[PDB]
């Protein structure tokens, strides 16, 4: 029997640059810290590796595949080993299993990214919705204010404007525009498109940018090699 | 040894698995909602809590059962290796699968109650916010009406009935009487229908409160864990 | 020697609904997140629990994470003379620690309501003094304005733009109107900003915080103290 060992750890910032750049488009200032993404990716690799190790052992011809921390009081790196029938085999078989686990995690991350895109899209559409509700409630308040001013202008018998149309009118001074013009305003303000702040148009643009994201455009790795599978020794 | 161990590997649920629960928390707390990652940790924390309680109870029997939960890899928090030692291979697998489902059902009942408590807290916080904001809007309106009532005394003495101005920006306690006693009387007479002025936060808060009432517990497809590996059918004894 | 065990974790949102609400009433948008309160309360429970065990070790009582490398839940145990005794002594000690953590928080909350109550009532008093001083300045200005308006023989308003009326051109209003302002000065309302009305409302809400209604737990039971069937 022959033992090949390798040392794996979380992927580099450069390896996850794209994945990190996608999470920033989806969540913005709420995007996970680059270090948190690295921990999640190696967590998912470690998970799938343990499942392979437990399955390889539960066979008619069991295969010993291991995973343990390389350093005593440290979470990472991880030492992964395989026991093969030949020296060529133990080393290749360990390298194949590491690649097999990576391919499974890559399929999992593709699904996870789609779920993250959906949540981000939901958060942005919900933002557009509340902003639309406040724009509509603001428009209705203005109409409501002109309708009350029209009542004052009717009692004060103000038909023609007294004020030379001020862009800064108020609930109190509105009646000075006269019945005539206030009736016209209750029409114009009712058909007036909703007024949004730039944040609305930015949220709109953030939503289009999420649509522009692709999984294929990101070469995402769930691990990094510290040491590649070693040439085995007789054991 | 005449004992068979079935093993399973569990971890925190996927983002997709808890998309509903996370949305509920966002509807209830808004910007104060827990991060999606924090929800995942809490849910798996809750699953392993209930699992550990089952394991401690299964050991405290006339015929003790060994049900174990531990991190799969040393020094890692997740994933978790759950295992059970049965009388047969088919038995150990079914008994572990049943116990995992039993813990999940208990956790699910707990989360249903917790969600109801969360919807109550969120509602009370938003209701308190609208209340406070309505009083300030109403107190602001009453101040203006008392100012108008005062100004009407100044207009009655100066015998100002019709408006005296041809270009107004905004009026103060001093300048209000220039609108004339006729307009001022009209404003007091219709003070009841004068609309309250609120900030956008009020309209947002009011909408958040309606959306909380839209939340359903059965509509959430929530599970507290994810299987990495389902309970194994052991080939050989332990 | 029988060991009774229990599994404890952070309290539920429902369990600390009262504590969280009082923090929200006192701090508003600066209040701690409900999840942060849960972590703090269980942190306080474990620390008081370890403190009790340490004092008990000075003449048995243990606290440790249930699952290796998971901060929560926590496994607590006690070794008693009987299974029935071990169970009751663990339950009593858990309740004892809970009462101590609850008493420390009751006291902390009272300190917080006092400081808040102080800060808000100082804010209202400052604002009331400024509103009254502003009103008095304006009345002095109106009285001075009336003297000029009498001399300039300006009785009816001479204002075509409200923009023309400043604290130095009040005489533009009627001498008739300025007399009316001085005559009805006592009923001229004090002008406060919305912040005053908000502050006042916040003060009433803090004063509505009653300890008679609230009851909070620094922990939740995952598993109650076991009745051990065998010695160990
Ligand atoms: Mg005159
Ligand atoms: Mg005043």
Author numbering:
A (entry chain A): 5 to 239
B (entry chain B): 3 to 240
C (entry chain C): 5 to 63, 68 to 240
Which text from the study accompanies this structure?
Despite low sequence similarities between PCP1a family proteins, the individual protomers have a comparable three-dimensional architecture, and self-assemble into a bell-shaped quaternary structure. However, different oligomeric sizes have been reported for different PCP1a family proteins. The crystal structure of the periplasmic domain of WzzBSF has recently been shown to form an open trimer, while chimeric hybrid protein variants based on WzzBSF and WzzBST instead formed octameric barrels. Binding analyses reveal positive cooperativity for the interaction of very-short (VS) core-plus-Oag polysaccharide (COPS) with the periplasmic domain of WzzBSF, and a decreased COPS-binding affinity for the A107P mutant. The crystal structure of the mutant protein shows only subtle structural differences near the mutation, compared to the wild-type protein.
The Oag polymer chains are neither all of the same length nor of random length, and fall in a defined range termed the modal distribution. This distribution is regulated by two Wzz proteins in S. flexneri: WzzBSF, which confers an average modal chain-length of 10–17 Oag repeat units (short (S)-type), and WzzpHS2, which confers a very long (VL-type) modal chain-length of > 90 Oag repeat units. The S. flexneri Wzz proteins are members of the PCP1a family and are located in the inner membrane. They contain a hydrophilic periplasmic polypeptide segment, and two trans-membrane (TM) regions at the N- and C-terminal ends.
